[PDB]
């Protein structure tokens, strides 16, 4: 997270760290959407042009964390994956269209002050809150500049108009994505970066005070460049797939 600040304890208790086993390393962020399902970006798990293709036993998730590196005993929970599901029409060849994946934990996790699921939006919540100029929040342990933080980082960023997102890049943007970040004329800065991919872009509903995961950190060109924006998987647009995976289990 570029130009963000330290999260408070328990500020993002749905935050999940995706960790590679061998070698040990933070791969991506992710989020807890129930006691046994974790959402992340498909590209964190599958990206053939970089020879990336993880299987369940290659990975762990760490839930409840604040420190990037310290083992947080009695606070964090380390879970194994039973199954990974990647959107069948995830487009890794072209533009990361439908950049979304679900991971089922081998056993449900107990909730706590530090571990708690985020909501997914319904139709009304998406229609109401996903509007240009309204802000959401991105969190992660990714790079501080395009340099790793000691603890989880947070920054709030505005949703940007689709034509401005499209003007900003030659990559083909689809309705399964949205972009966010400040414009060059707004003075303020801030973006997700390498290592934050897969983590949540959330909004606190003004109608019911619940936090909803509206986006997943998906792609960007550099981090925090003037005239460039972060791009996010549009969770609500892909919700029927999410529900199909969860239901059918």
């Amino acid at each position: 997270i570029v130009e963000g600040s330290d999260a408070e304890i328990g500020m993002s208790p749905w935050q999940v760290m995706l960790f590679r086993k061998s070698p040990q390393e933070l791969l991506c962020g992710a989020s807890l959407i129930s006691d046994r399902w974790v959402l992340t970006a498909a590209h964190c798990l599958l990206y053939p042009p970089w020879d990336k293709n993880f299987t369940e036993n290659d990975l762990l998730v760490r839930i409840g964390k604040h420190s990037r590196t310290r083992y947080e005993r009695n606070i964090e929970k380390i879970s194994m994956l039973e199954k990974i599901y990647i959107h069948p029409r995830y487009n890794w060849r072209e533009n990361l269209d439908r950049d979304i994946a679900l991971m089922k934990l081998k056993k449900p996790v107990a909730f706590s002050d530090y571990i708690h699921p985020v909501c997914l939006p319904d139709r009304e919540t998406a229609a109401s809150l996903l509007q240009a100029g309204y802000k959401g929040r991105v969190t992660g342990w990714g790079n501080l500049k395009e340099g790793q933080p000691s603890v989880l980082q947070v920054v709030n960023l505005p949703i940007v108009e689709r034509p401005v997102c499209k003007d900003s890049t030659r990559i083909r943007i689809t309705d399964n994505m949205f972009c966010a970040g400040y414009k060059p004329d707004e003075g303020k800065r801030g973006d997700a970066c390498e290592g934050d991919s897969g983590g949540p872009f959330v909004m606190k509903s003004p109608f019911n005070n619940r936090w909803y995961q509206m986006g997943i950190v998906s792609w960007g060109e550099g981090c925090d460049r003037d005239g460039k924006y972060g791009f996010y998987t549009h969770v609500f647009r892909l919700k029927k797939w999410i529900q199909k995976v969860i239901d059918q289990f």
């Binding site: 590209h43 390498e194 991919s197 998906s218 792609w219 060109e221």
Partner: peptide, 4 residues
């Protein structure tokens, strides 16, 4: 490109 990809978040990475």
């Amino acid at each position: 490109x990809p978040x990475c």
